[PDB]
Design a binder for this molecule. Structure first.
Ligand SMILES: CC(C)CN(C[C@@H](O)[C@H](Cc1ccccc1)NC(=O)O[C@H]1CO[C@H]2OCC[C@H]21)S(=O)(=O)c1ccc(N)cc1
Lengths: 99, 99
């Protein structure tokens, strides 16, 4: 699909068996999802953006369906105000910025 | 152009006659630039990011060249870790997300 930017580019994702709404974010290096339970060992990481840093749990090799497209990669879990799909997964689904 | 996301989508912008580097960010509603002197009066605005809120100065009708495309709109100036080109300006250059 070709997404216009008049509004937030929100899509439905499936992760860990749950359905969630997330933002397709070209400005995000990594994907960050609100607090939830995921299987596996994880390692702590600090992620910084506007306003500062938050502590997150880094889970590797997580499968996520984005708008119906299966993808695999690292997912950071923590206190984010919105679910964000970053470049690490956008590349996997072949997303591009066009103008 | 068609920009892939294996690397941060950074482009050159020309504002106030100066050349700077900026990130094409579909996850940002608004355009935010690092501290610099812009013309006219400003209005206050609070911007919420991943790590909290910062206070910024809002300047309207600012002329900005993005990767060679002229745009005229609102620009926020504040303590951002990187210059961000948000949806308000992305729409003016006709950017879309495609996959
Ligand atoms: C600041 C950028 C370099 C990176 N940010 C992604 C960015 O797209 C966020 C993503 C974002 C989106 C909504 C809420 C929090 C974070 N948007 C944002 O900061 O925008 C602010 C200015 O415009 C306003 O409208 C959106 C919030 C304001 S980030 O959220 O801090 C971030 C940092 C590291 C990773 N791995 C993933 C994301």
């Amino acid at each position: 699909p070709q997404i216009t930017l008049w509004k937030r580019p929100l899509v439905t994702i499936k992760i860990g068996g749950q359905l969630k709404e997330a933002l397709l974010d070209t400005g995000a290096d990594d994907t960050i999802i609100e607090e939830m339970s995921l299987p596996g060992r994880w390692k702590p990481k600090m992620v910084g953006g506007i306003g500062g840093f938050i502590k997150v749990r880094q889970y590797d090799q997580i499968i996520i369906e984005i708008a119906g497209h299966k993808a695999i990669g690292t997912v950071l879990v923590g206190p984010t105000p919105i679910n964000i799909i970053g470049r690490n997964l956008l590349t996997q689904i072949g997303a591009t910025l066009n103008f």
